[PDB]
Amino acid sequence: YEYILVRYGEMGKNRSKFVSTLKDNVKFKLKKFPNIKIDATHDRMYIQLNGEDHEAVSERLKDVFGIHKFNLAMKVPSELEDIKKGALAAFLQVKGDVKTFKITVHRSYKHFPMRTMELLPEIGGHILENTEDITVDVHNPDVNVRVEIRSGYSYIMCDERMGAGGLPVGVGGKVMVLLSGGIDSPVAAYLTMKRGVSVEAVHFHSPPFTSERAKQKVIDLAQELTKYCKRVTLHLVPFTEVQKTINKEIPSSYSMTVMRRMMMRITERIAEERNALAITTGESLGQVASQTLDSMHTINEVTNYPVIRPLITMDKLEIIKIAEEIGTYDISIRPYKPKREKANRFEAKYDFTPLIDEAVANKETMVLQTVE
């Protein structure tokens, strides 16, 4: 009711970069709760509520990567009486079938006048004589009342919620994610972010002979991903001229291979511009619509940038499960052996460099946020 105490996932200078990234991301997520103050130490993040609805704050906190668990806590002055009080207040904030309880005491303030042995019956007694049909269970308690005793101030909590886990978005760096309208790529973007890497999305569209409705899918997908980070930058690359030239200059059996090669070349040029160190795709091995190893081998020739492939060894079912969980599935669902020698030999016949450079120069950038 007074505080939310967030416990970090897992991590010197590495912790600083972790904490301050988490701070900024949490701050941004809760900015529509302007009364809150946040102190983030190297071991714990303290969210001072100052009247702000703890439930409302909780519902937004659970979507932030980098948080293992968090607790709704009471911060009370550190003598027995103020401790007794805070325990009760914390206890009463627990909705649901509440019939039994337990008290647990961590004593970090070693010079506290009373012993844990003695504190137990005291706090229990105070909750007992201030409730109605409620007893204690040491073995099967409904509500665990945990008392952390520190000097000056002490925390009481009963309400432990799971966080999203993973790593604060931004701590690991930045990659470009190749986003398309299928089920896969948004999932891959999501998994990248969960490991603390922020993503900028890159989408190739060919405005005449691809529809606006298909472009809206990608925008909608990028919009949905805003739930998991501060903002999603979406680069829309006009691909139509490159697509046309490939049809004219390249033998048909290789047109798709070269187009994907051209996609990767352009994406690398964007990655450099944006100081991104890798490129994410939703490629996976061995599905009907998934490319062969031969295809992958031939397309990857054009870049020695890491190509992060989160779904590389995942099956359709686990991919769909996640897409459903994160809520990109129903948007995605809207219904709209190559060799290196030959790929090179065909590309030798026309200089795609001006096309590549213009496509980079012509990209449009949207910046999406969760619109509260």
Ligand X SMILES: Nc1ncnc2c1ncn2[C@@H]1O[C@H](COP(=O)(O)O)[C@@H](O)[C@H]1O
Q: Which residue has the tokens 């769909």?
A: 320
Q: Which of 296, 326, 331, 359 binds a copy of itself (CB under 8 A)?
A: 296
> Which residue number, 81 or 301, has a Cβ lying nearer to a copy of itself?
301
Footprint of ligand X on 286-305 (CB under 6 A)? 291
Q: Which of 282, 305, 331, 346 binds ligand X (CB under 6 A)?
A: 282
Least Å distance, CB 189 to a copy of itself, is: 10
CA–CA distances in Å: residue 195 to residues 23, 132, 171, 312, 323: 17, 47, 9, 16, 17
* CB contact set of 228 (below 8 Å; sequence gap of 6+): 63, 65, 164, 169, 190, 193, 194, 326
User: Does 179 interact with ligand X (rule: CB under 6 A)?
Assistant: yes
* CB contact set of 81 (below 8 Å; sequence gap of 6+): none
Contact region with a copy of itself (CB under 8 A), list: 93-101, 147-155, 163-171, 213-221? 163-171
Least Å distance, CB 177 to a copy of itself, is: 12
> Which residue number, 198 or 332, has a Cβ lying nearer to a copy of itself?
198
- For residues 169 and 218, give the distance between their C-alpha atoms in angstroms, rounded to a whole number: 21
Q: Which of 184, 220, 224, 347 binds ligand X (CB under 6 A)?
A: 184
> Which residue number, 135 or 247, has a Cβ lying nearer to ligand X?
247
Q: Which of 180, 192, 332, 370 binds ligand X (CB under 6 A)?
A: 180
Burial 294-327 (b: 16+ CB within 10 A, else e): ebbebbeebbebebbbbbbebebeebbebbeebe
Q: Which does 180 bind (CB under 5 to 8 A by kind): ligand X, a copy of itself, none?
A: ligand X
- 3-state SS string for 294-343: HHHHHHHHHCCCCEECCCCCCCHHHHHHHHHHCCCHHHHCCCCCCCHHHH
Q: What angle do CA 80, 160, 142 make, to 5 degrees?
A: 75
CB 148 within 8 A of CB 154: yes
Strand pairing partners for 326?
none
Q: Which does 293 bind (CB under 5 to 8 A by kind): ligand X, a copy of itself, none?
A: a copy of itself
> Which residue number, 7 or 297, has a Cβ lying nearer to a copy of itself?
297
User: Does 265 interact with ligand X (rule: CB under 6 A)?
Assistant: no
Tokens, residue 140? 């099967």
Q: Which of 112, 190, 204, 254 binds ligand X (CB under 6 A)?
A: 204
- For residues 258 and 240, give the distance between their C-alpha atoms in angstroms, rounded to a whole number: 14
CB 3 within 8 A of CB 47: yes
User: Does 285 interact with a copy of itself (rule: CB under 8 A)?
Assistant: yes
> Which residue number, 240 or 303, has a Cβ lying nearer to a copy of itself?
303
Tell me the Ramachandran region of residue 50: left when phi exceeds 0, alpha when psi lies from -120 to 50, beta otherwise. Answer: left
Angle between helices 80-92 and 116-128 (to 10 degrees): 50
Q: What is the 8-class DSSP label of residue 1?
A: -
Footprint of a copy of itself on 186-245 (CB under 8 A)? 191-192, 194-197
Q: Which of 56, 128, 138, 293 binds a copy of itself (CB under 8 A)?
A: 293
Binding site for ligand X (CB under 6 A): 178-180, 182, 184-185, 202-204, 281-283, 291
- Name the binding residues for ATP: 178-179, 203-204, 260, 282, 291
Tell me the binding residues. Answer: 178-179, 203-204, 260, 282, 291
| List of residues contacting a copy of itself (CB under 8 A) | 10-11, 165-167, 171-173, 175, 191-192, 194-197, 277-278, 284-286, 288, 292-294, 296-297, 300-310, 312-313, 315
